[PDB]
Amino acid sequence: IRDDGYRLWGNRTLSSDSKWAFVTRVRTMDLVMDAILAGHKWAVDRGITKTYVKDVTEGLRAFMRDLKNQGAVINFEVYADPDLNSASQLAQGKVYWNIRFTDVPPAENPNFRVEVTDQWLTEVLDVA
Amino acid sequence: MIPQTLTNTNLFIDGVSFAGDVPSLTLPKLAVKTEQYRAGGMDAPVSIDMGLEAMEAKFSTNGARREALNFFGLADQSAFNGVFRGSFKGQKGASVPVVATLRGLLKEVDPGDWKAGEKAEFKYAVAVSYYKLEVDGREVYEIDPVNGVRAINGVDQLAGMRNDLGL
């Protein structure tokens, strides 16, 4: 936009969905998981014990409060899915978790409502 | 009921029968570890359980019997296996077997006084690491401290603490 070609300007991606409008939304969701996955590589081995599903949640919450600390998210929510953790799923090795979070919004449009008044035309410029 | 009493005992150490030389057996005394619990709003203690006590089974032979002497003090604890058997008679003649398979460490060998004309009795004692009592061929007790199991009628009483500890 400016100054002999100085600054990249837009931040919308080419999405037809307003839930995925910003590249902030797309990049954060993409790289919250790449930090979650690369960091929980022990969950594909390590055959299912009783506290397998608990040690992943507290591991998932711990590598997600590191993300709330540095400002990637705001007030995540991690919990094991209570409705889809069957034992028929567990014999197949499947076990589910829910990793809801909120992304930080970019300040896309700051709005300045500027007005010229004659209010302080008497407060100064007078004998007073 | 019918008046019923033990009449005969037997001992199997490692499958070998001691059917000539065990004058006395002693099953382990199952005692729960009570703490007398007196607290607010009550005048008397109430004795909460805190787990089981340590189990010792002791038995005596009065011959030489290397087939029980060779299990003292091994590096492998819980390698002394052993079956204490009893036949409880009953007045009508229906003999009921009481069989107590147990496993542990033979922890003391006590050769007593050796007087010349007197019968000499080797007193042994094992430190019980597994204990199953069957009465009339039906499981009464099953106590395994490691892999914490306390079954009382086939019903494992420690399923409550097992899920709490994530065992």
DSSP conformation letters of B145-160: TTTTEEESSS-BTTHH
Start-to-end CA distance of chain B, whole Å, equals 42
Residue-range domain boundaries for chain B: 1-167
**What is the rounded distance in angstroms from the CA atom of residue B120 to the CA atom of residue B107?**
20
Q: Name the H helices within A11-126.
A: 23-37, 52-70, 88-91
Q: Do A54 and B166 touch (CB under 8 A)?
A: yes
Q: Does residue B166 sit at the A interface (CB-CB below 8 Å)?
A: yes
**What is the rounded distance in angstroms from the CA atom of residue B32 to the CA atom of residue B141?**
13
> Which element (helix H / strand E) includes B164?
helix B159-165
Instruction: Kindly state the tokens that stand for B36.
Output: 């007398």
CA dihedral A49, A50, A54, A55 (to 10 degrees): -30
Helices A52-70 and A23-37 pack at an angle, to 10 degrees, of 140
Exp. method:
cryo-EM
Instruction: Kindly state the tokens that stand for A2.
Output: 């400016």
**Distance from B165 to chain A by nearest Cα, in Å?**
10
**What is the rounded distance in angstroms from the CA atom of residue B122 to the CA atom of residue B78?**
21
Residue A11 near residue A22 (C-beta atoms within 8 A): yes
Instruction: Kindly state the tokens that stand for B117.
Output: 């004309």
At position B130, the amino acid (one-letter code) is: Y
**What is the rounded distance in angstroms from the CA atom of residue A62 to the CA atom of residue A71?**
15
**What is the rounded distance in angstroms from the CA atom of residue A73 to the CA atom of residue B149?**
46
At position B34, the amino acid (one-letter code) is: T
Contact list in B for residue A53 (CB cut-off 8 A) is none
CA-to-CA dists, residue A7 to A2, A10, A11, A104, B3, angstroms: 6, 10, 12, 22, 102
What are all long-range contacts of A34-43, with beta carbons under 8 Å and residues at least 24 apart?
A35/A63, A35/A67, A36/A60, A36/A63, A36/A64, A36/A99, A39/A63
**What is the rounded distance in angstroms from the CA atom of residue B21 to the CA atom of residue B19?**
6
What contacts A93, CB < 8 A, 6 or more positions away? Answer: A48
Residue B142 near residue B151 (C-beta atoms within 8 A): yes
Helix, strand or coil for residue A86?
coil
CA-to-CA dists, residue A110 to A97, A102, A106, A107, A113, angstroms: 38, 21, 10, 7, 10
Instruction: Kindly state the tokens that stand for B142.
Output: 């099953």
Contact list in B for residue A58 (CB cut-off 8 A) is none
Instruction: Kindly state the tokens that stand for A75.
Output: 């007030």
Q: Does residue B167 sit at the A interface (CB-CB below 8 Å)?
A: yes
Instruction: Kindly state the tokens that stand for A70.
Output: 């540095």
CA-to-CA dists, residue A59 to A54, A56, A64, A73, A74, angstroms: 8, 5, 9, 17, 18
What contacts B163, CB < 8 A, 6 or more positions away? Answer: A50
Q: How many residue pairs bridge chain A and chain B with CB atoms within 8 Å of each other?
A: 6
Instruction: Kindly state the tokens that stand for B52.
Output: 């089981």
**What is the rounded distance in angstroms from the CA atom of residue B120 to the CA atom of residue B64?**
10
What contacts B8, CB < 8 A, 6 or more positions away? Answer: B86, B87
Q: Does residue B64 sit at the A interface (CB-CB below 8 Å)?
A: no
Start-to-end CA distance of chain A, whole Å, equals 49
What is the CB neighbour count within 10 angstroms for residue A26? 14
